[PDB]
Design a protein around this ligand. Structure first.
Ligand code: HEM
Ligand code: NA
Ligand SMILES: [Zn+2]
Length: 187
């Protein structure tokens, strides 16, 4: 898990809960004097432990917290990798380019990142079938991110998530409906 993910998480926790809470989280779930260098790899268990702690503090379902983080996370990355996201002029293009453009770039920007396997298929009625697969099973982070990407393009979406690794499958299917964006008028 790359430091950049931890950095954006810090920004989120500091904004919602305060720096005092972030320091508690860091002292408890990370070794002494931990500093997350953005480009460096760290143990994903450090992230999961922090996020699980946050969920418990807020009395929220863990996946609802991961989804919220995902939405916050898209803006964090879009602002840290503005050149990558500016390759796309709309939400649908970006989603269709997550694997072959965005995360492909991430392999050139970062040393050996740990990334999901994603494939998007355009459907009729302005829908997208996004297939997700990863041993980390962060499909709800992916949902959040998609909602973040929608917000970035002033678009509105709904997501159905009825095939899932958490209910036994070896992948998730995220069916995205684009309800509105700047190029969508009556239908
Ligand atoms: C809707 C858009 C996106 C989706 C759905 C998505 C999906 C994901 C997910 C779910 C993960 C967690 C790892 C896993 O699941 O195995 C991940 C990792 C990552 N992605 Fe994204 N992503 C999106 C956009 C972006 C953008 C815009 C960037 C930066 C330009 C980016 C760069 C990264 C990085 C740096 C990691 C961490 C890799 C590591 O820790 O080794 N992604 N991606
Ligand atoms: Na519109
Ligand atoms: Zn899932």
């Amino acid at each position: 898990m790359k430091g950049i993910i931890f950095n954006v998480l810090e920004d989120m926790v500091v904004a919602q809960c305060g720096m005092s809470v972030w320091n508690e989280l860091l002292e408890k779930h990370a070794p002494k004097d931990r500093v997350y260098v953005s480009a460096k790899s760290y143990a994903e268990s450090e992230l999961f432990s922090i996020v699980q702690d946050v969920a418990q503090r807020l009395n929220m379902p863990i996946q609802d917290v991961v989804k919220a983080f995902g939405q916050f996370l898209f803006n964090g990355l879009a602002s840290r990798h503005t050149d990558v996201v500016d390759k796309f002029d709309d939400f649908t293009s970006l989603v269709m380019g997550i694997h072959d453009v965005i995360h492909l770039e991430v392999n050139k920007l970062y040393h050996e990142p740990s990334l999901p396997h994603i494939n998007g298929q355009l459907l009729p009625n302005n829908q997208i079938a996004l297939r997700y697969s990863s041993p980390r099973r962060l499909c709800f982070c992916a949902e959040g991110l998609l909602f973040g990407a929608a917000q970035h393009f002033a678009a509105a979406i709904q997501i159905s998530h009825d095939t899932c690794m958490h209910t036994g499958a070896d992948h998730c299917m995220l069916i995205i409906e684009l309800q509105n964006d700047e190029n969508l008028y009556f239908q």
